[PDB]
Amino acid sequence: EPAWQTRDHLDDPVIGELRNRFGPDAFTVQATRTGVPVVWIKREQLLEVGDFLKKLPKPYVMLFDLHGMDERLRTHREGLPAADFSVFYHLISIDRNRDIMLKVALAENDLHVPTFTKLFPNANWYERETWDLFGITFDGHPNLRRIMMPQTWKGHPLRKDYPARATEFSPFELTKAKQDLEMEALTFKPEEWGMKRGTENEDFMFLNLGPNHPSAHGAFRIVLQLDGEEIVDCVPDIGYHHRGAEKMGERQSWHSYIPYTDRIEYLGGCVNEMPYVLAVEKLAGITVPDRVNVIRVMLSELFRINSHLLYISTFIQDVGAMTPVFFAFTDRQKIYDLVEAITGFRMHPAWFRIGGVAHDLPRGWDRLLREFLDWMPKRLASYEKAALQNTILKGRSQGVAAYGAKEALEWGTTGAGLRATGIDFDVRKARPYSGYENFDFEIPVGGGVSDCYTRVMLKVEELRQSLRILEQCLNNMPEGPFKADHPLTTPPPKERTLQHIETLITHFLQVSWGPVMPANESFQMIEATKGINSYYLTSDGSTMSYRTRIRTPSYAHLQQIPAAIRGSLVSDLIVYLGSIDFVMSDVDR
Amino acid sequence: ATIHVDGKEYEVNGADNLLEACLSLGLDIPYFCWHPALGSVGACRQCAVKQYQNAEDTRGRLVMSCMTPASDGTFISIDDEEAKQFRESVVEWLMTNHPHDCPVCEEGGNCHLQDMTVMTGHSFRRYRFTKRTHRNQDLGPFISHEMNRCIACYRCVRYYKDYAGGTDLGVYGAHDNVYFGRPEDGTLESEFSGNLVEICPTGVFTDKTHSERYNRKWDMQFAPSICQQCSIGCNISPGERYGELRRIENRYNGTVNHYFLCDRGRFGYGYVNLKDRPRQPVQRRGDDFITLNAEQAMQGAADILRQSKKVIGIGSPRASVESNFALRELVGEENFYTGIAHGEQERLQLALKVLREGGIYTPALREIESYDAVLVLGEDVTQTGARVALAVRQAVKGKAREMAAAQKVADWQIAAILNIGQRAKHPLFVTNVDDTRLDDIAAWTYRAPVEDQARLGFAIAHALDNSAPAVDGIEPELQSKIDVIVQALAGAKKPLIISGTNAGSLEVIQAAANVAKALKGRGADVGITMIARSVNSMGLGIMGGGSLEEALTELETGRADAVVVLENDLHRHASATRVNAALAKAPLVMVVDHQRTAIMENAHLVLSAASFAESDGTVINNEGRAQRFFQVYDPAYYDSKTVMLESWRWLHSLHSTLLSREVDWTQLDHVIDAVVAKIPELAGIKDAAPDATFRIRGQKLAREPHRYSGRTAMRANISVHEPRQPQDIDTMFTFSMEGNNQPTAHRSQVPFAWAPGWNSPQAWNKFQDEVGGKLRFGDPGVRLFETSENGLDYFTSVPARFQPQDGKWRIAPYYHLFGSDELSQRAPVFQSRMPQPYIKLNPADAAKLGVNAGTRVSFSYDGNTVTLPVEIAEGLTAGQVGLPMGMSGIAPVLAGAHLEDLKEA
Amino acid sequence: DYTLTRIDPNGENDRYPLQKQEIVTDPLNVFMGKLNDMVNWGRKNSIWPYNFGLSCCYVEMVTSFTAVHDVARFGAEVLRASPRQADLMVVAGTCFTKMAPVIQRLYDQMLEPKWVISMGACANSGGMYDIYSVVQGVDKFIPVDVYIPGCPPRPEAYMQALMLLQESIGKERRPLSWVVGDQGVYRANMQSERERKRGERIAVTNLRTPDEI
């Protein structure tokens, strides 16, 4: 039985516990291709269900995702409660290694849900995002304001009636009045945040760290309330890097959305490509062969080494040593030589396809892979012994912005931070995707404290394990097809397209109108370069995505930022920013 | 009936087969040879499903869902493994000989064969041998032929012969060398041959007019509109690309024009893409021709209109309801004149009085196919209202349909129906000045002058009911034919009487009304159908006004020093010399038109109006249905200096500048509400379409498909900065793909049909409640008037017998589907299809004059000694000259007129 | 073959950019021309980029900063974090709607002379992101000197655009002193690279097959 089959998920013990707790007429179970039990629950019992899941013997301790969905345009809703809007809550229990997805149905006029922030503190930014893009109000939320759009924005962009393109609206006319109005909108108002901008002894200092700061890894701004050098409170202001990629997912075909998936986490590349194409293959019912899995593992581990090299060099640069970034980018250029050879592009390859990859491996890729595998470990050991074993770097890093497993779980922290708290939870081992079971590699974990130094050394060990994976896949690569034999493989193989009429017809209708994926819900969760990246795709049975929800780890890390750096100095914040491994396309999407 | 599809219980209609029942429920079964209009023949063998007779049955039997009735207690499986493999094998067998032609095929992206190859999931080729090839034929200027792409599904021949009644298309050849076409090269002379490009699931028959300037279906910007080439008002989907009208697709209206258009309405759209059209307001200063924008044109026009003592307005039946009303409200009630002549207006008002006061229900075009005995009086339907002639052919085959239904044979078994009803058919009696194209199925054809046709109609009315006025002087053989017609009409259950204003006589319409009244008096379900001339003739008749002669004499006597002509050439309804003298004598001629007419030399100001592809409006068709047509594209998006607006917008802003000295661009709903407020008889045009505030769950209706391409590059030669998409404040549509085009949306105006997996015109299946039936959530357009409680009285003005006077020749009209329309003949593709101007003569009259066939004779009408070559017409009665109406220099107003000095020159 | 721009923020002009451009002739003097050539050489051979980054294009720009490309050889590595000390704004990333006032402010905070290089399809026209929250090109409100197509442009394309900027600077005319002479900025109307390279681009016949490496 294939793993993409629509599973009703009535064999999960969490469903039985929910039946024995709330009764058999309290919820509906939706059969999806997510691999996760989807439970439609009533709005009145949402907090009780959340408390019951939090108080389980092996509880669901993490809020993975929280977002809305416009169901007004969804034609195929058989077996679902009647809804104009819906809110889904994706929760993870690491102890059971299980997920659940609670869905709440809302009418068009009664668009209010009880807040989830008391059960999970990381729900704050998710609820602000759901209010900003869908207009759904959360009762009891502390500060429900726009988080992706500026405060002087009319309408909610992820609603179906909102226009997706900039050409629908008037072209961007920057006048003096508009500049003044948007500058007053962008000015930080501490009375809105309850910052209390003064003390009897002295005055607090309000500083904009970002958008134009060397320490900020993008266009975002942390507003710091300071006394002298110490941070009293922080307001991380995001939404400056919003590209509307989910609304773009509603606007492109299944095949033509792959380059947009590539730019979600621009240091990730094929790592960003994999969850989307895996979810689309779950929707289509495509089981890719072994060679496709090994090639995709190759490219994603190569890009993981690339991203980790950039992260380590960036951390060393923000600590103060400006030398190893040059050599780390030289190693990045070696990886880029291999990636240019394979995919034809440097940093956004867009090489993964539905059912396979764009081309076969060119003749001679193993020579460049062997060159990189010989070049890498001496350079990495040099970086370690030159900067990562530096006592000044250790003084700037060890003990700085430290949190335990409780803070990592309550804020949805994934990736190197969660493993640095001692929780051994990696997606490539817990829920193995793309044939990662065939590769012998270790998962580094920490001692229980998630320092800057601990996260950086964990990423160094992850780089070494990725080098081991690359060596294993270089020594054993299958000799088969680079595309699946499914009819929904988009696009079909090129030579058959160029000389057969069936293949020409399939190519013609798949690159123009798009592949028709039948109406189902799919979900794929992978271990990204910066944490856990997930794609949740709702298909309406058409050639375009009805809903594309992208869960990213940098969003959770930036929401965790005020709770881990409050009371510290600004230097600790600089090291914390350099040691988080975030980019801002990842956050704002 | 109750069926079980894949274990799911469904309630279907037991008189339908399994294919249309399952397609109505939304179940996707592949099919080629079945069409909702043609029937089931079981040719392509693509619709296979596995049938079980019991709920507990494992083996089953592969049957054809198109040939299997949807009886109660049938358990069918569509996605069973055996059925799916057989359907994939049928697609594979069709793919063995199919050419590698999809990039160079006009049907690519609109192909049913592509959609069904993808739907069955066949994408691997194991056939390694050669593919058969075919030569191609020249089918004329409209249809391009590519025989290699054929799958031998027999849809073309079934439509063209068993539906359209054509005679030059057929199947030839053998085992796998089947050819579909003509026995030689030549033009397909059926008036409905253009539907072959949508009937054919492959790219064999393609639109050559669209193939000249070809774009794909996703690149097309569509709109729902009404065809403006005659009075039937078929719903069309005009689609444009790069600022020019590319294609006219069929728009499904289950009430009017369900699957089929006529060739004039499908290939006569080329006048929109003419380069001589006015694109700006142009003002004449002596010999100089200066160009204004909208504001200066309004200010100058209002200044000269205020500096005049009386302003009159000449409308047109070519204009919409709103533009004619805006002219009427600009110039006043008493100063508004309809652009048609006095006789044309008299015939039009008589036809309207018969329709909305005669007490006889006027059927819709779909309902014409259900009437038993058809009597056509005076109308040449196949050349003026051709789609009505197609529905008349269907009503004629209704006899074979009922005879096969008497033998417990299903409705969809079209081959068995044609086998049982071999040549027996419903009675059809056509009267004309000559032979018609309905004569192959007509029970009788009466070739006579219009006076004698009217006398035969009055004799039929007198023989059906003795209270009708009698006509004395009928020959005994004609009396025998009349009593044959009377016995056929009296024995019918639903008789239909079809007349119109194109016959050129009032007494023909009076005789048709008397026949309908006599049939109603016997207790019969009689229907009557008047065929008007232009698209909005009935709306102009309802709104009313003076004739063109009254406006001409008002200009000639000097009481009118300002004339506003709305979309009229004025040479079609009156003599060119008198019109030219009247417009030259008037000191201000202001012409709102979108086509370069001949009266623009004398025009002091020309307003570049918008055609149907660039304007919104309402048109009233021949049966009194108000239909809204929507704008397809904004003309100023590509060409920035184009100032081309709606004619009602022109005239409303002109009246606002006349009154308050302010330019006011209104909205379509404001003009609509003005019509409903001022004219109570046009009150139904408000409900023809919903207003601009209508939304489908908050979003508008998309004019283009969701895969519309080239957005950031289609205007990059002008400027690299892409402008905002044009905003439609008039309608509920948007000039973008950011909108709704779902098959399950609660609307009646569908711009185009597309569904996931259905890119062909078979995508209209998803937009109907049942396939081949009504559109889902009702058809667009509402009827203006209902059938009255009481009817008219008998018209006692029986005309005298036509006596051929010496010297004077009565002009017999000869209408042509290609040539007799004002705007269709301006299309460049119609030049190769329009017949040469030939004057038709009797052999006896030509022998008296010494003329043989071919040579040229000259006749003078209103000081115009024009010379035409002579064609001998045996069926034409002596004393008449046959002239082609609507040609160059021969107006349709010439019908019924005299002709002096007919000499060989 | 020159274009003249004069700026006036305080004048009656609401829409950005607050400048007026006409087409003029070259004003260029036996020593003033040579001194103008010398200052043009000094400005073109010492360009200090602004440490302003928006998106992935900035990551490729700082890849160009590193040792494997060495844009320091052109003297363009200093990378000031202050707008006052910078001479070149490389808009390397998407021009978001929420950051267009920020970009306008940072462009206002630079000092004369200033040059603008838009890097990538987002900065040029909005690129793939024809979306509600993206300005369709940074040239909607700032004047852009050099455009780089790409997504991201490779680092050598960034140095190619830097050399194009140097060639543009080396033949432009600027006010030598702010107390004597005309204060308008004269920039050359150079021939485009497309028509310049059309001769060598059309004549390309054969390329290496994609199966090779």
Ligand SMILES: CCCCCCCCCCC1=C(C)C(=O)C(OC)=C(OC)C1=O
């Ligand atoms: C000039 C000497 C080499 C510099 C190399 C810098 C490499 C990237 C530094 C990290 C960083 C990233 C990724 C980044 O995206 C960013 O935001 C725009 C920064 O602030 C300017 C950064 O500092």
Ligand SMILES: CCCCCCCCCCC1=C(C)C(=O)C(OC)=C(OC)C1=O
């Ligand atoms: C009139 C004299 C002008 C001198 C200008 C010197 C500019 C600075 C050069 C050295 C330098 C410093 C201090 C510097 O801060 C720096 O940033 C890390 C560099 O690398 C990009 C440098 O090369």
Ligand code: SF4
């Ligand atoms: S008829 Fe259809 S399948 Fe055949 S070549 Fe044309 S587009 Fe392709």
Ligand code: SF4
């Ligand atoms: S020409 Fe077209 S309609 Fe006719 S049999 Fe062939 S595929 Fe069918």
Ligand code: SF4
């Ligand atoms: S019958 Fe008349 S309205 Fe219909 S398509 Fe033909 S010309 Fe147009």
Ligand code: SF4
């Ligand atoms: S052009 Fe491409 S690489 Fe550059 S900012 Fe835009 S998405 Fe990133």
Ligand code: FES
């Ligand atoms: S559709 Fe039934 S055999 Fe053709």
Ligand SMILES: [Ca+2]
């Ligand atoms: Ca309009």
